[PDB]
Design an enzyme around this catalytic site. Sequence first.
Site, PDB file in Angstrom:
ATOM      1  N   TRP A  97       0.816  -1.205   0.000  1.00  0.00           N
ATOM      2  CA  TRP A  97       0.000   0.000   0.000  1.00  0.00           C
ATOM      3  C   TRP A  97       0.852   1.258   0.000  1.00  0.00           C
ATOM      4  CZ3 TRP A  97      -4.423   0.847  -1.718  1.00  0.00           C
ATOM      5  CH2 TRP A  97      -5.386  -0.177  -1.736  1.00  0.00           C
ATOM      6  N   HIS A 261       6.010 -12.013  -0.411  1.00  0.00           N
ATOM      7  CA  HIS A 261       5.508 -10.644  -0.376  1.00  0.00           C
ATOM      8  C   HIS A 261       6.409  -9.717   0.432  1.00  0.00           C
ATOM      9  CE1 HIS A 261       2.836  -7.289  -0.592  1.00  0.00           C
ATOM     10  NE2 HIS A 261       2.776  -7.219   0.727  1.00  0.00           N
TER      11      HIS A 261
END
Length: 285
Positions: A97, A261
């Site tokens: 984000w 990730h």
Amino acid sequence: PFERRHVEVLGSTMHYVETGEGPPVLFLHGNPTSSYLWRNIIPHVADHGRCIAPDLIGMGQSGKPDIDYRFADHVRYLDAFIDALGLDDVTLVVHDWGSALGFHWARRHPDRVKGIAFMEAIVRPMPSWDDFPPQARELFQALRTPGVGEKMILEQFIEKILPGSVLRPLSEEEMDAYRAPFPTPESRKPVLQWPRELPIDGEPADVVAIVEAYAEWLATSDVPKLLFYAEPGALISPEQVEWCRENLPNLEVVHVGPGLHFLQEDQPDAIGQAIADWLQRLASR
């Protein structure tokens, strides 16, 4: 090894760490992390610029105001933070984000951005659930369901998704640092809202439009870009690597080796050394 500071922002406070001097390098974490994510990358970059890593509002050691924690809320707090430090000629280093926040800020402040390094990033909206690996599909669909997501994240997550997307074993001490901002259901509201902001299958429409807008800007802007690829990754697959290589001007790609990730916890030295080399080559232009 870093200065720790708090800055008043929109009636709350934001914590950040900083070290070094020179042109600013702004590190933006994503969900559910904090400036701690960058602790082993920053030292590689610190002699090359003024390294600044904020905790997004409601995360890390930043304040926890009574807000929705939608993407638009985070935009407001981070805009005020960046203006609070008077940042200009900014190199962005972004993840998850943080990349959406960083791309969105860069498009809106194109004269103040010097370069963007990004990893496991939200470059484009995700047009259908079919694009997702089945594992992430079921998780994201569950989190985005009212009731279920609250049960999974609030009234009960960080202990499973964080080590789940790091290849090497995460230490208890690193896990404690990531758990620390989020002891309570009240404190975990941002961690649940973030997946519900993901631009998937047209919803939410306001974030989808934001990501569309900065993807168009990225494909048209001469800003220097550095993309990190990990094998196999999560958000950034070889497919996304090829889309970036084809469509984003002035882009260099660096393969950092095995990672999922949270590749900062798998290959921090590879990432830091590549950023340091990149800043030097950009200065040589």
